[PDB]
From Swiss-Prot:
Function according to Swiss-Prot or TrEMBL: Lysozymes have primarily a bacteriolytic function; those in tissues and body fluids are associated with the monocyte-macrophage system and enhance the activity of immunoagents. Has bacteriolytic activity against M.luteus.
InterPro entries: Glyco_hydro_22 (IPR001916), Glyco_hydro_22_CS (IPR019799), Glyco_hydro_22_lys (IPR000974), Lysozyme-like_dom_sf (IPR023346)
Expression (tissue specificity): In the egg white and polymorphonuclear leukocytes.
Protein name, UniProt field: Lysozyme C
Gene transcribed to yield this protein: LYZ
GO terms for cellular component: cytoplasm; endoplasmic reticulum; extracellular space
Residue span, C-type lysozyme domain: 1-129
Gene Ontology BP annotations: cell wall macromolecule catabolic process; defense response to bacterium; defense response to Gram-negative bacterium; defense response to Gram-positive bacterium; killing of cells of another organism
Amino-acid positions noted as binding substrate in the UniProt annotation, renumbered to this chain: 101
Disulfide pairings: 6-127, 30-115, 64-80, 76-94
Matching CDD domains: LYZ_C (cd16897)
GO molecular function list: beta-N-acetylglucosaminidase activity; identical protein binding; lysozyme activity
Enzyme Commission numbers on file: 3.2.1.17
Oligomer and partners: Monomer.
Organism: Gallus gallus (Chicken)
Length: 129
């Protein structure tokens, strides 16, 4: 499923991401935009052999089991395939663990390089939340 901007904003807010560990909703919508273009089905392979999954491109090196990432963890205790559902529950609940692990949203390279230090407020501009 490809979300609209305000659609993903509303769903993320319902799933408790608004100001989770201090990251306003706009940070999360900005991250999703530049990770997946709001597409729950987004997959991209890392050079190390790991693969990134879903709306927030959660990586199989640490967070999920794709069955082909040797010497890797499943710290969200899920199949990576569950990160590609039209229901963002699994991506959201795993992202809450990732952002809690001490590095915050810097774990999302696209957030660091494209959202960090910008008018992230702009991503929820006009939305009924
Ligand atoms: Au959730």
């Amino acid at each position: 499923k490809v979300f609209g901007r305000c659609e993903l904003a509303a769903a993320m807010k319902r799933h408790g991401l608004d100001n989770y560990r201090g990251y306003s909703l706009g940070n999360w919508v900005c991250a999703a935009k530049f990770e997946s273009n709001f597409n729950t089905q987004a997959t991209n392979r890392n050079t190390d052999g790991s693969t990134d999954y879903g709306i927030l491109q959660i990586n199989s090196r640490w967070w999920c089991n794709d069955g082909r990432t040797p010497g890797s963890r499943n710290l969200c205790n899920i199949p990576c395939s569950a990160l590609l559902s039209s229901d963002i529950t699994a991506s959201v609940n795993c992202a809450k663990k990732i952002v809690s692990d001490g590095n915050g949203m810097n774990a999302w390279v696209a957030w660091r390089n494209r959202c960090k230090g910008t008018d992230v407020q702009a991503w929820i501009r006009g939305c009924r939340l």
